[PDB]
Design a protein around this nucleic acid. Structure first.
Lengths: 151, 117, 51
RNA sequence: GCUUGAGUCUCGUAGAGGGGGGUAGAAUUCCAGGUGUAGCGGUGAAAUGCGUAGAGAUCUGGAGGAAUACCGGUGGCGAAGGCGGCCCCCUGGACGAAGACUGACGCUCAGGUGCGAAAGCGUGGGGAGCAAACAGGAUUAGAUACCCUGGUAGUCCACGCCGUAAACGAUGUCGACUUGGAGGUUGUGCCCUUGAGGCGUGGCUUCCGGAGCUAACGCGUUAAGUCGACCGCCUGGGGAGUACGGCCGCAAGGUUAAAACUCAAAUGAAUUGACGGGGGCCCGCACAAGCGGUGGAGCAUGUGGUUUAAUUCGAUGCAACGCG
C-alpha cells in the first residue's frame, strides 16, 4: 500500500442464496478457519430471522444491515502537528464491511444461548434499530457530527 | 417589531473567532452571534464551519425585523468571512453590497513584538 | 472595496481582496517594528527575483 | 612661467541631505452617549484577564500621543551614523552644458578638533501604542525562559552628557593604467521626433564574468589586477582587551595598556563522510486498514539473581535468553 495499488480477490457467493454479501458475512463471522460452522450459524440465525420478521431471508438481513451502515466516520490526520479527528465519507464496500463487523461483534457481546440466537436477536434488534450495533453507528455519527468543523 | 426591512451584516472575522452583527443602516445592532457561542469552543471556533453556523444563528434572532436586503461589511482576516456571507444568502437575504472594511493604518501604531514559537 | 451587482448574480466572486488588503497587508502589520529584518527580507526578496 | 591637477564664475538638473515651523488622512487607546446581548480575548491546548454593575460587536461625538500605508524600486541623498506624508522658511553638497578666470593654490596626516545608531545618564515636559523590570497564568522534572494576560522605566520633545556597535563593502585616503556583457538612476549633444526611436558623451550605482591575483573561497575598470604617496594596525592560543597607573566621564563606563602563569597548538578555506527536532524524491507489515497473539492464570523450557560442596563452561541491546 506504500507503492502497490492492488486488485481484489473474488469470493464465491453463498451456497444457499447466491449472495456474495452474505458470503462476506459468513467470512466476518468465521473463526479459526471453520467455515462450515459459521455458515451453519448464519443459516440458522437468518432462518429464524426470516421466520420471526416474516419478510423473507436476505431482505430482512438487508434491512437489519441497512440500519447499521455508517454514513461518515472520523479518521486521524496528524498534518499540522496536531491530532484531528476529521469526518470522512465511507466507501460502500467499507460501509457494509463495517456494518457486518459491528453486527458480528455486538452479537458476540450478547448473553443468549447459541450464536444463532445471539445473532438472530442482534439482527432483530437492528431491524427496529434499537440494538448494540446501532449504538455503535450512532456513536460513530456523534463523533463525525461533533467534529463536522474539519472539511 | 419595528420592521426595518434593510440592514447591514457586520462580520468581524479574526484569527480566533468570527462575530457576526446584523444591524440597520443607522448602525444600531439588531442581534449578533459569535462562532464561540455556538458550541465548539477552542480550536474549532476559528473555522469556516463555525462562522457559517454563527451566521445561520445570526440570521435567526432577526426574524422580528423582516430584513430582506442587507449590505455586508467584512473586518479582519480569518478562516471565516467567506463562508459567512455564503450562509447569509443561504438564509433568504438579498445580499446587496460586500465591502471589506479591515482597518489598515497608514503606518500608525507599533504592532506587538511577538511569537518566537 | 465595495461591490454591487444587478439581479444577474450568483456567486460572491469578490477577488478585489486578493488584489489589495487581505493576504499580505494585514498579516504584515500583526508583528514587530524592526527596520532590520525588512531590509534583509527585501534584500533577499529582490536577490531571489533573478533568472 | 604654463595648463592637462586643484579651485572660482555663468545656466540648469535630480534628490527621504540638514535645521526650524505648520498641517493632513488612516489606525490604536481612552472618555461620554445610542442600539444590543451572552460571551469576549487568548492558545498547540488552556488558564490568568475582561464581561449581565452590560463586555465584545456596532454607530455618533470628543481628546491625546506616536508613526507617517499605497508610491517604494540590489531606487535616491549623505563623510560616516543615518535620512520616507504634504506645505513654507533658513541651509549644505553633488552632477551636467558651453565659455571665462586664478594659476600647482595639490595628496595624505601622528598629536588636535568636530560629527557619531541604539541602549544609558542629567534637568524640564509629554506619555496613544509597544515594552526591559515586575506580577499573574501556563509549559516543564525544574522554567528566575520561550507562549498567554497585564505592565513601569524607556521609546517621543527641549537642552546638556556619553561615545560605543557584526559603527561591515568584516576591504583607510588620494591618483594613474589594464579585455567584456546585461541592467538601474540622473544629466547633455546629434539625427526624418516621421512614437513608447537611432547614434554618442558624462556622474552615481547593481549583477555576471576575462586576464591577473588569491591558501582557497572569491575579487574582477566601483579590484582583492598592475603601480605611486601618506596614514592606521598585526606578530601563536589563553590569561586579556583584563589588572595597575594616567586622561575623560555625573555614573554606567570609555580610552591608553601590561605581567606572572599555562598550552602545543589556536586558526582560515576547502575535501570525504557522518549527523540534523534542514529540504526534495523513494522503499519495507514501518505506520495506517484488519485478524490473531504476548504482558494476567497453570505448566514447559531458557536466562538473571539467590542458594550450594558443586549448582561446568560459553552466548547478553536489536543480532543473548527451549541459544551452543
Amino acid at each position: 500500500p506504500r507503492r502497490r495499488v492492488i486488485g481484489q480477490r473474488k469470493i464465491l457467493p453463498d451456497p444457499k442464496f447466491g449472495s456474495e454479501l452474505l458470503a462476506k458475512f459468513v467470512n466476518i463471522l468465521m473463526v479459526d478457519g471453520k467455515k462450515s460452522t459459521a455458515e451453519s450459524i448464519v443459516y440458522s440465525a437468518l432462518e429464524t430471522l426470516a421466520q420471526r420478521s416474516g419478510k423473507s431471508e436476505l431482505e430482512a438481513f438487508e434491512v437489519a444491515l441497512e440500519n447499521v451502515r455508517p454514513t461518515v466516520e472520523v479518521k486521524s490526520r496528524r498534518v499540522g502537528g496536531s491530532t484531528y479527528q476529521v469526518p470522512v465519507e465511507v466507501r460502500p464496500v467499507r460501509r457494509n464491511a463495517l456494518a457486518m463487523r459491528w453486527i458480528v461483534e455486538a452479537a458476540r457481546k450478547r448473553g443468549d444461548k447459541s450464536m444463532a440466537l445471539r445473532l438472530a436477536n442482534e439482527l432483530s434488534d437492528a431491524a427496529e434499530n434499537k440494538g448494540t450495533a446501532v449504538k455503535k453507528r450512532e456513536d460513530v455519527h456523534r463523533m463525525a457530527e461533533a467534529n463536522k468543523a474539519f472539511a | 417589531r419595528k420592521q426595518v426591512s434593510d440592514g447591514v451584516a457586520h462580520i468581524h472575522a479574526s484569527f480566533n473567532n468570527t462575530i457576526v452583527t446584523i444591524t440597520d443602516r443607522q448602525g444600531n445592532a439588531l442581534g449578533w452571534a459569535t462562532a464561540g457561542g455556538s458550541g465548539f469552543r477552542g480550536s474549532r471556533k476559528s473555522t469556516p464551519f463555525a462562522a457559517q453556523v454563527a451566521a445561520e444563528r445570526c440570521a435567526d434572532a432577526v426574524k422580528e425585523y423582516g430584513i430582506k436586503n442587507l449590505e455586508v461589511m467584512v473586518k479582519g482576516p480569518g478562516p471565516g468571512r467567506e463562508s459567512t456571507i455564503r450562509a447569509l444568502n443561504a438564509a433568504g437575504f438579498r445580499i446587496t453590497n460586500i465591502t471589506d472594511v479591515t482597518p489598515i493604518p497608514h503606518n500608525g501604531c507599533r504592532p506587538p513584538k511577538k511569537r518566537r514559537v | 472595496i465595495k461591490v454591487r451587482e444587478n439581479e444577474p448574480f450568483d456567486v460572491a466572486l469578490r477577488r478585489f481582496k486578493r488584489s489589495c488588503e487581505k493576504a499580505g497587508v494585514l498579516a504584515e502589520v500583526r508583528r514587530r517594528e524592526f527596520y532590520e529584518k525588512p531590509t534583509t527580507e527585501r534584500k533577499r526578496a529582490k536577490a531571489s527575483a533573478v533568472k
